[PDB]
Amino acid sequence: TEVVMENVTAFWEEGGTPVLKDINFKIERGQLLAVAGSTGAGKTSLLMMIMGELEPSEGKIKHSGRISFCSQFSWIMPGTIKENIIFGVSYDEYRYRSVIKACQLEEDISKFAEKDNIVLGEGGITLSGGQRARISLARAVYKDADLYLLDSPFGYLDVLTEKEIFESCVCKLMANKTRILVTSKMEHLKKADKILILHEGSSYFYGTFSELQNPDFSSKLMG
Ligand SMILES: Nc1ncnc2c1ncn2[C@@H]1O[C@H](COP(=O)(O)OP(=O)(O)OP(=O)(O)O)[C@@H](O)[C@H]1O
Ligand SMILES: [Mg+2]
């Protein structure tokens, strides 16, 4: 047991409608949990709760450990690509190199004369959205953390790159890590240990891929 939610309900608006209603799950160390559902279902809000940014109105959240969060929206601080990835933490050569490879940043870095020492301005608006997204993922995965919260880290990448990085980073590099991945792709759900499908704040499904089927679930993963 590393993350537990029991009977969790929450409101952003003090007197409005619940953003999450009666959420239940448990994640054990090293497991991959897929959190799926359409726009507005409550996926990011669920992560906010784990991070203590959204307090429950009822129920219990039990988690132990340092969180590393990859936001749905990429961000870039003033500094080099290297400094953005390392982000405070001490530099470990092997760790750094493996993350850069897993997030396909080798080819990008090589194209600048200053390499990963190129200086970016706040927002990194001279880079592409894909480049910023892969740096933001690299930043999250480089961190020594107990719980990795990855909020749609491939939403600004093409389908092939998404497949490749899901494999190289989430599946291979992070194989021993406790991961919560916001994603609705069938391939990703198939590889997850557990799946939570949210629909309009509620738990539409919680369980394994084999349970999911044996019916119309896939319609609830879209939009
Ligand atoms: N950090 C935040 N602070 C305040 N309100 C938020 C925050 N994140 C989400 N909300 C609000 O909570 C509600 C639930 O939406 P949420 O962002 O959790 O859905 P989601 O499943 O992440 O959607 P998407 O797939 O579009 O990213 C929305 O009304 C949203 O405006
Ligand atoms: Mg979201």
Swiss-Prot record:
Q: Which residues form a coiled coil?
A: none
PTM note says: N-glycosylated. Phosphorylated; cAMP treatment promotes phosphorylation and activates the channel. Dephosphorylation decreases the ATPase activity (in vitro). Phosphorylation at PKA sites activates the channel. Phosphorylation at PKC sites enhances the response to phosphorylation by PKA. Phosphorylated by AMPK; this inhibits channel activity.
Effect on the protein of changing F87R: Impaired maturation of glycan chains indicating impaired trafficking from the endoplasmic reticulum to the cell membrane
Disease cited in the entry: Cystic fibrosis: A common generalized disorder of the exocrine glands which impairs clearance of secretions in a variety of organs. It is characterized by the triad of chronic bronchopulmonary disease (with recurrent respiratory infections), pancreatic insufficiency (which leads to malabsorption and growth retardation) and elevated sweat electrolytes. It is the most common genetic disease in Caucasians, with a prevalence of about 1 in 2'000 live births. Inheritance is autosomal recessive. Congenital bilateral absence of the vas deferens: An autosomal recessive disease characterized by vas deferens aplasia resulting in azoospermia and male infertility. CBAVD may occur in isolation or as a manifestation of cystic fibrosis.
Q: Which residues carry this modification: Phosphoserine?
A: S128
Q: What name does the UniProt record give this protein?
A: Cystic fibrosis transmembrane conductance regulator
Where found in the cell? Apical cell membrane; Early endosome membrane; Cell membrane; Recycling endosome membrane
Please describe, based on the UniProt annotation, the reported consequence of changing S128R: In CF; impaired maturation of glycan chains
Q: What family is this?
A: Belongs to the ABC transporter superfamily. ABCC family. CFTR transporter (TC 3.A.1.202) subfamily.
Domain of life from the UniProt record:
Eukaryota
User: Quick one: effect of changing A192T?
Assistant: In CF; impaired maturation of glycan chains
Q: What is known of its domains?
A: Binds and hydrolyzes ATP via the two cytoplasmic ABC transporter nucleotide-binding domains. The two ATP-binding domains interact with each other, forming a head-to-tail dimer. Normal ATPase activity requires interaction between the two domains. The first ABC transporter nucleotide-binding domain has no ATPase activity by itself. The PDZ-binding motif mediates interactions with GOPC and with the SLC4A7, NHERF1/EBP50 complex.
How it assembles, according to the record, is: Monomer; does not require oligomerization for channel activity. May form oligomers in the membrane. Interacts with SLC26A3, SLC26A6 and SHANK2. Interacts with NHERF1 and MYO6. Interacts (via C-terminus) with GOPC (via PDZ domain); this promotes CFTR internalization and thereby decreases channel activity. Interacts with SLC4A7 through NHERF1. Found in a complex with MYO5B and RAB11A. Interacts with ANO1. Interacts with SLC26A8. Interacts with AHCYL1; the interaction increases CFTR activity. Interacts with CSE1L.
Lipid attachment site numbers (S-palmitoyl cysteine): C103
> Residues that bind ATP 1, according to the entry?
W12, G37, S38, T39, G40, A41, G42, K43, T44, Q72
What is this protein's gene name? CFTR
Q: What does this protein do?
A: Epithelial ion channel that plays an important role in the regulation of epithelial ion and water transport and fluid homeostasis. Mediates the transport of chloride ions across the cell membrane. Possesses an intrinsic ATPase activity and utilizes ATP to gate its channel; the passive flow of anions through the channel is gated by cycles of ATP binding and hydrolysis by the ATP-binding domains. The ion channel is also permeable to HCO(3)(-); selectivity depends on the extracellular chloride concentration. In vitro, mediates ATP-dependent glutathione flux.
Q: List the disulfide bonds.
A: none
Q: Which stretch of the intact protein is present? A: 390 to 646 of 1480
**Substitution effect: H199P:** In CF; impaired maturation of glycan chains
Instruction: Please describe, based on the UniProt annotation, the reported consequence of changing I135V.
Output: In CBAVD; uncertain significance
